Amino acid sequence: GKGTPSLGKRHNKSHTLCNRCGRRSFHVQKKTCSSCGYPAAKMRSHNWALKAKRRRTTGTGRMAYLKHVTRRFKNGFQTGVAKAQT
Amino acid sequence: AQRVTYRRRNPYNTRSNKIKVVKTPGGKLVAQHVKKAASRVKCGDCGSALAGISTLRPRQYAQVSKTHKTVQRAYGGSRCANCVKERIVRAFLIEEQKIVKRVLKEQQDKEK
Amino acid sequence: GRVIRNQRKGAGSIFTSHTRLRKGAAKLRTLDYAERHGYIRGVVKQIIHDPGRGAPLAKVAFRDPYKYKLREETFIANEGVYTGQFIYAGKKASLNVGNILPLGACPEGTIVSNVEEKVGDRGALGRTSGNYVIIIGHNPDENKTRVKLPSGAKKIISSDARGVIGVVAGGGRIDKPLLKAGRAFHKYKVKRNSWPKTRGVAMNPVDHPHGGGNHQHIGKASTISRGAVSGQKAGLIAARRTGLLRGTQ
Amino acid sequence: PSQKSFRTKQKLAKAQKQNRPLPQWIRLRTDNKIRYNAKRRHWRRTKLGI
RNA sequence: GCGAGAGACCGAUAGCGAACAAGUACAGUGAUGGAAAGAUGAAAAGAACUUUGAAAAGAGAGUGAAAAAGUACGUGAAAUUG
RNA sequence: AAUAGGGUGAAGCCAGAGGAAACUCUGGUGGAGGCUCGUAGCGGUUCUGACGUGCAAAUCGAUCGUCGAAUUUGGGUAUAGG
RNA sequence: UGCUGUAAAGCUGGGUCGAACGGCCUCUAGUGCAGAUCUUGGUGGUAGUAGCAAAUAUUCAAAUGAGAACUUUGAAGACUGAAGUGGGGAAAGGUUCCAUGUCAACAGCAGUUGGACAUGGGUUAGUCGAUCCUAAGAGAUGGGGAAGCUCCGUUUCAACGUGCUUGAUUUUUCAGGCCAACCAUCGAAAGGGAAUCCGGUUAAAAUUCCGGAACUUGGAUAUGGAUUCUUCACGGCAACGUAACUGAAUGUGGAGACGUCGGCGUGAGCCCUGGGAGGAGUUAUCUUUUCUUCUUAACAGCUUAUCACCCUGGAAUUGGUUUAUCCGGAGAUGGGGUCUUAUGGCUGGAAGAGCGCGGUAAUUUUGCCGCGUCCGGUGCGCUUACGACGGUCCUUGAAAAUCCACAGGAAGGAAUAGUUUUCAUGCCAAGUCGUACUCAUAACCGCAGCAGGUCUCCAAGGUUAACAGCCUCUAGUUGAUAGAAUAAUGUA
RNA sequence: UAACGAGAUUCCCACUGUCCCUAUCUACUAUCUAGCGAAACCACAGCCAAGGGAACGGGCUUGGCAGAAUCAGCGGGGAAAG
RNA sequence: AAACUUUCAACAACGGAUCUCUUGGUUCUCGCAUCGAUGAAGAACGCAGCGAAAUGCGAUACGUAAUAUGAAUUGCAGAUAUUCGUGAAUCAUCGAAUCUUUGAACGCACAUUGCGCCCUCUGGUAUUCCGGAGGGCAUGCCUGUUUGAGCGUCGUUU
Ligand SMILES: [Zn+2]
C-alpha cells in the first residue's frame, strides 16, 4: 500500500512561499528557503548548479537601477540640468 | 427528527466546542454553543469550596459586585470559616505560650 | 557496519528524559547563614507523587531570612513524614526524622538520606525509595565522616555535608512483580525511551557486534575490554568475573 | 480553504485575472503574431502550486 | 558587464536550452529538471453577394500574377491511403 | 479526538447455617481483568478466488485476526544519508 | 521521355514550381547510411478488433429543440435507509459558486445538458476565527568555538528597565518613592481565551446584511442613591446576608487547571402517548380513524440542589444509610437553618415573531382581513450534559497569559460640608485580515470526472440484546453507453 | 507444562458434488447490432513428411499435395510475447 | 467473371522532407571600467479608453520634468489636442523627480498585510483614551560630545 493508497495522504505542505524569492520553497518547520537560503544574509548559489544561476541572476529581472548606470557613466556622472540652446 | 450542525468552523468535539440543542421560536432545532463550566472557589488552607461566593469563569469576576466575591469576615473570600477559626485559636494560644515560656526563663535565669 | 543502538543515545534525540509531569528537582536548601550557625524551621505542605520517581516528594515552606517572602523547597520525603510536620534544618537542629543536619552533628549509626558528597551540592547519595546512608564513623580533626552507601561502598565526606534523617519513603517497590509488558510500558512512558530492548544477537551484523550467523550466538567473548571504543562496548564491559555469583564477595 | 491568509488570497486574485482569453482587437494590429492566450489554466487540470 | 567590428562558422532535428509572450509552458514536497513552436501574398486585396444547409460547411461568384497561395496558407518528398 | 451490544463473574460488602474454637458452608450483592463472543475501527489468514495491456504501479469479493488497551488516529514537534 | 558510363553517377523530354544556380582549374571539411534493443518526427498492420459488464432499475407523456435512451417538468416504479447516496465543517483546491448565452474541443455512446466554453455578478463582523498565551520545541543577544559557511548556549563567568508610581510643574523644568527573583522573540484556525441571540432577507452572503432585543472591553463623566459630627455601612449566636459600604508597596491564596472506567441520580433534546382547536388521506365494508400544526432564542429579575457548612442535643437495646458499607463523643439520628444556581419553574424578551387554517386583492411591486396558536401524561427508552460516588496504577494523568479575593496598613480623608465610577442611570468607541463553493464513486491526492486513500459533528419508526442485519419516514439520488437474443468456455 | 494459537502434523464423529459422474438452473459476459475505439507484437511470411544442415525447417532438396472470401471457438506449433 | 490481395501510373489525401531564405546563434578581434544603507540585484502586487502575455513603469504607475527635434499615433475610438508653433509624437536625449509591498532590509515580528514606542500637527468635551497626517526608533565599529562607574589611583580636610 505504498503506491496509490499512500499517495492519498498528501495534504500537509512541507514548503510555503518564500518572502525573498517567492518560489514556494520556504521550509515551514526548518524556517529556511531551500532555493535562496532565506533568512540568511547571502543568497544560496553554487558553482555545481550553473543552470540555477541562469534562472535567477542580474538581468532576469527589471534591473531598474543598473539599467541607467552606463548612461550616467557615459556623461561623466553629470550634476545639474541641461541648458536651453540660445 | 431535525439534525443540527456546529455554528463555528470548529468541527471537533473539543472541550471548548460543546453544544446544547435548543428549540427556537422558529420551530427549529439548532445547536447552541455552551461555554465551559466554572469551577468553585476553594479554600487556601483545606481546599474545600468556599461558601457564599459566586461560581464564575475567571474573567467574569471583574464585572460583578464585591459582595458576590467575598464574605464579611477575616480572610473572607480566601479561607473557610473553620480554617479562620483554627488560625485565631492557634495564634492566641501559641502567643500566650510564648509568654509562659519567657516568664519561666527569667525564673530560670536569676537563680542558677 | 552501522551506528549501533548504544551510540545513538548520546545524541539524545528520542532518548531524552520525559519531563513534562515531573514536579521539580528534589534538592536540599541552599546552604546559608541560618543553617550554618543555627536552625531554620519550615512546614510540610504537600507530599506528592513525582512521575518517574519511586520516592514521594515533600513540598516544605520556609521563610526567607532577608526579604518578606515564602520559599518552597522540594525534598525527598523520608518515611514517616506527614503534612504539617515541622522540619528543622541547620547545625543546631535536633536528631529527628526528616530534619536536615550536618553529618558531623550526627552520632555513629545514624540513618540518613539525601546526603551531600560536597558541601552545598544539595544532596546526592541515597535518594531512591527504601535507600539510606549509614554514618560509620567520624574523624573529627580533619573534619571527615565515613559513611556506608546503599551499594556497600564506604566513602569519606566532609562533616559539613548535610543529610536528612530517616529512610527514603516508598520502599519495597521492587518486591512486586510487574507481570505484564504493559506495566513496564507504563513505567518507562514517564522515564525515557529505553524499552523494549531487542537482543543484539537477534540482529544482523550491521546493527550489532553480536548479530549474524546461521545460529543466534555471540561468537566471540562477550567480555569487552575497558579500553575498547564506542561501537565495541556491547556486552559485559570490563568484567572482573562472570557466571552465577556463588558465595560471598 | 475558507480560512486563508491575505497573502494567499492576493495570489489567487492574480491567477484569475490572468486566466482570460485574448482580446480580439489585438489580432488586428499590424505585425501581430499572437493568435490566442497560450497561458490559460483550468482549475482541475493544472494546479497553481501556491 | 558595457560598446563596436568581423568570419573559408550554423542555417530552424543545425546554431545557445531558447531565431517565436524561453529559462517560457509543464513536472517535482524540494534541491532541481525543462520543451515544442520561423516562412500566404507586393498589398488582406483574408472571399462581398446568391443558393443548399439547424449549423459547420458546400456550390456558384469574387480578389489576386497565381486560390496548383484560403490563415488546417511558399515548395509539399516518403512511409501510409482513396 | 474516537472505540454498539452481550458473556463470565475477582476483591470488598449483607444475611443465613454448622463448630468447643480454629474456622467451614450457602444465598445474594459488587463489577475486576494487557478476560471472552461480537459491530464500527485497525489488520491482512485462506481461497494460493477475481483481476492481472486491471477500477487500481497492490485493488475487488468472500473468509478471517483483534476489537478498552503494549489500542486507533488528526495536528504540532524532534531525529537526515555511512 | 530517353541517352551516356562496368559502376559510383551525369545529362535530357514532360509535369509541378517561383529566385536563385551551375561547368571547368584548384582549396577546404561537421562530406556519402540499411541496420547501432541508434536519435527525433511521422505512419501502418493488428483493427472497426480487444473492449466500453462492480455499486438492485427503470418506464410513459408533455415541453424545448434541426435533432431527445441521456435536457426540463409531470405521473409512476425504485434505492440510499439517520455508522445514509442526508445536513455541515478541518486539511487541500481556488471561482469550480450564481445568472445569461452557448456546443468547435472535453464529459472513452450521445448531448438542446455540464464542475466544459463566453460574458457578467457575488464573500459586509466590537461579539465567529485569526490576532494574544504558553506546550513539546525553535531561536536572536552577551559570550565561547570555528580558516570560514557558521556551531554551542537561552540568562548562560553580562554594568542587560526603549522601568513603573504618585504629587505635579507648567517653571514643558521636575520632586521624589518603589522595584528589576523570572522575563528577546517565535511556537496551537482541535489546548487556554472578554463579549450575540432570534425572526426576515439574495440568483448567489449572512451568528456579518435588515428589524428587534442584549452583552463585553476601553475611555470620558454627571446625576441619583449609598456613606461621614462614633469619619472609611449595617444585620445574623452562627454558617453568612445586602444596591453601595477607603485601602499603596509588598505578600498569601484561588480560578485558569486537566487521566480513565463503572453503575446510579437529575436535567435537556428526541422517541412514545391523552384531551381539545384546525388541515389533509381512506371509506364496497370497518375504522370516536391514519398523517400533520399547536413553537418560544440570547439576555434580566425572583425562586429553585445534591454535596458542604452552622446552631441546639448528647447517642449500645448502637443508630442513620447507598444499587454499590460507609458514617457518628474529632458529636450520629432528630429539630431548625446558611450556601454554590449546575439544572428547572414563573415573569419580562414575546406574539408584535413564527406556525396552521379561513376569507378576499390582483397584469399587480407586494398584500390585506379574521380565527387559533391550549392543557397534560409516561419511561431499566436513546443521545447527551451535569452531579454525587466507587474502582484503577512500580501509570497519579500540561503550562502561561489573564482575572479575583484575602493579608497588610502607606496615604488620604467630613459638618455646612466632604468620598465613590466594585450601586443604578446616562455618554463615546471598538482597528486589521478571513468569510463564495466542494469536502468527495466528478471540486482534494492518486498522470484522469480512477471501485484506492483522506480527520470529525448531528442521527426517526418497526423487529432485535443491538448504533448489526432487514423494511420504512425526513432529506437526497435514479448517476454507471445502450438495443436484440440467451451457443460453448467463463465470473458470481 | 494448564491456558492461549488465521502456527505444523495424525486420527475419529458430523457434514458434504472433493469424488464415483456428472446434470440442471439464474445474473453478468462472450455472441449480433448502433456509437466509440486502443495495445502487446511485427525481417519476410505463414500446409505437411523425410533428408541433409549450427546435429529438432515456414522457406533449402525430394515427395504428398494445392481453389476466392471468411465467422465462432481452441490452445498442438510459431523452439509465441514479456 | 466479380469481390478481394499485390504491383504500377495519374489525380486527390496524410505528413512535413527537400529547396531557397533568416531582426538568431557561435567564434575571433577592438575599446571601455561603471552595482549597493543616497537602499542594490532579485521578488511580489499593481498601472493603459478598450490588454491576457511580452515590453515599460510605480498610486505622479505602458509614465512626470528637462534638452533636442519638428507633425504625428494607428486595431479601433476620442479630445475641455496640436500645425510659419514654448508644438503632435519620440526610453531621441536625459543632468530634475516619483519610485507600492519587500529584499543586504534596519522599531519588534512575519505560514500574521501582527504588535509597538517617541516628536509635531489635527478630530473626538483630553498630558494619560480612541482616530488621522507627517517625521522617527537596527547592529558592529570609528572620531568626538555629554552623563557616569570603580579605595584603579593623585593633591587637600578631618
Ligand atoms: Zn527563497
UniProtKB/Swiss-Prot annotation, chain A:
GO terms for molecular function: RNA binding; rRNA binding; structural constituent of ribosome; zinc ion binding. Its cofactor is Zn(2+). It comes from the Eukaryota. InterPro entries: Ribosomal_eL37, Ribosomal_eL37/eL43, Ribosomal_eL37_CS, Ribosomal_zn-bd. One of its GO terms (biological process) is translation. Its main location: cytoplasm. Component of the large ribosomal subunit. Mature ribosomes consist of a small (40S) and a large (60S) subunit. The 40S subunit contains about 32 different proteins and 1 molecule of RNA (18S). The 60S subunit contains 45 different proteins and 3 molecules of RNA (25S, 5.8S and 5S). Component of the ribosome, a large ribonucleoprotein complex responsible for the synthesis of proteins in the cell. The small ribosomal subunit (SSU) binds messenger RNAs (mRNAs) and translates the encoded message by selecting cognate aminoacyl-transfer RNA (tRNA) molecules. The large subunit (LSU) contains the ribosomal catalytic site termed the peptidyl transferase center (PTC), which catalyzes the formation of peptide bonds, thereby polymerizing the amino acids delivered by tRNAs into a polypeptide chain. This is Large ribosomal subunit protein eL37. It comes from Candida albicans (strain SC5314 / ATCC MYA-2876) (Yeast). The gene is RPL37B.
Curated annotation (Swiss-Prot), chain B:
The keyword Repeat does not apply. One of its GO terms (molecular function) is structural constituent of ribosome. InterPro entries: Ribosomal_eL34, Ribosomal_eL34_C_sf, Ribosomal_eL34_CS. One of its GO terms (biological process) is translation. Its main location: cytoplasm. Belongs to the eukaryotic ribosomal protein eL34 family. Component of the ribosome, a large ribonucleoprotein complex responsible for the synthesis of proteins in the cell. The small ribosomal subunit (SSU) binds messenger RNAs (mRNAs) and translates the encoded message by selecting cognate aminoacyl-transfer RNA (tRNA) molecules. The large subunit (LSU) contains the ribosomal catalytic site termed the peptidyl transferase center (PTC), which catalyzes the formation of peptide bonds, thereby polymerizing the amino acids delivered by tRNAs into a polypeptide chain. This is Large ribosomal subunit protein eL34. The gene is RPL34B.
From Swiss-Prot, chain C:
One of its GO terms (cellular component) is cytosolic large ribosomal subunit. One of its GO terms (biological process) is cytoplasmic translation. The keyword Transcription does not apply. SUPFAM superfamilies: Nucleic acid-binding proteins, Translation proteins SH3-like domain. InterPro entries: NA-bd_OB-fold, Rib_uL2_dom2, Ribosomal_uL2, Ribosomal_uL2_C, Ribosomal_uL2_CS, Ribosomal_uL2_dom3, Ribosomal_uL2_RNA-bd_dom, Translation_prot_SH3-like_sf. Keywords: Cytoplasm, Ribonucleoprotein, Ribosomal protein. It comes from the Eukaryota. The keyword Nucleotide-binding does not apply. Gene3D superfamilies: 2.30.30.30, Nucleic acid-binding proteins, Ribosomal protein L2, domain 3. Component of the ribosome, a large ribonucleoprotein complex responsible for the synthesis of proteins in the cell. The small ribosomal subunit (SSU) binds messenger RNAs (mRNAs) and translates the encoded message by selecting cognate aminoacyl-transfer RNA (tRNA) molecules. The large subunit (LSU) contains the ribosomal catalytic site termed the peptidyl transferase center (PTC), which catalyzes the formation of peptide bonds, thereby polymerizing the amino acids delivered by tRNAs into a polypeptide chain. Belongs to the universal ribosomal protein uL2 family. PANTHER family: LARGE RIBOSOMAL SUBUNIT PROTEIN UL2 (PTHR13691:SF16), RIBOSOMAL PROTEIN L2 (PTHR13691). This is Large ribosomal subunit protein uL2. It comes from Candida albicans (strain SC5314 / ATCC MYA-2876) (Yeast).
Curated annotation (Swiss-Prot), chain D:
It comes from the Eukaryota. GO terms for molecular function: structural constituent of ribosome. InterPro entries: Ribosomal_eL39 (IPR000077), Ribosomal_eL39_CS (IPR020083), Ribosomal_eL39_dom_sf (IPR023626). One of its GO terms (cellular component) is cytosolic large ribosomal subunit. Keywords: Cytoplasm, Ribonucleoprotein, Ribosomal protein. It is found in: Cytoplasm. Its main location: cytoplasm. SUPFAM superfamilies: Ribosomal protein L39e. Disulfide bonds: none annotated. Residues 1-22 are annotated as: Disordered. Component of the ribosome, a large ribonucleoprotein complex responsible for the synthesis of proteins in the cell. The small ribosomal subunit (SSU) binds messenger RNAs (mRNAs) and translates the encoded message by selecting cognate aminoacyl-transfer RNA (tRNA) molecules. The large subunit (LSU) contains the ribosomal catalytic site termed the peptidyl transferase center (PTC), which catalyzes the formation of peptide bonds, thereby polymerizing the amino acids delivered by tRNAs into a polypeptide chain. Belongs to the eukaryotic ribosomal protein eL39 family. HAMAP family: Ribosomal_eL39. Component of the large ribosomal subunit. Mature ribosomes consist of a small (40S) and a large (60S) subunit. The 40S subunit contains about 32 different proteins and 1 molecule of RNA (18S). The 60S subunit contains 45 different proteins and 3 molecules of RNA (25S, 5.8S and 5S). This is Large ribosomal subunit protein eL39. It comes from Candida albicans (strain SC5314 / ATCC MYA-2876).
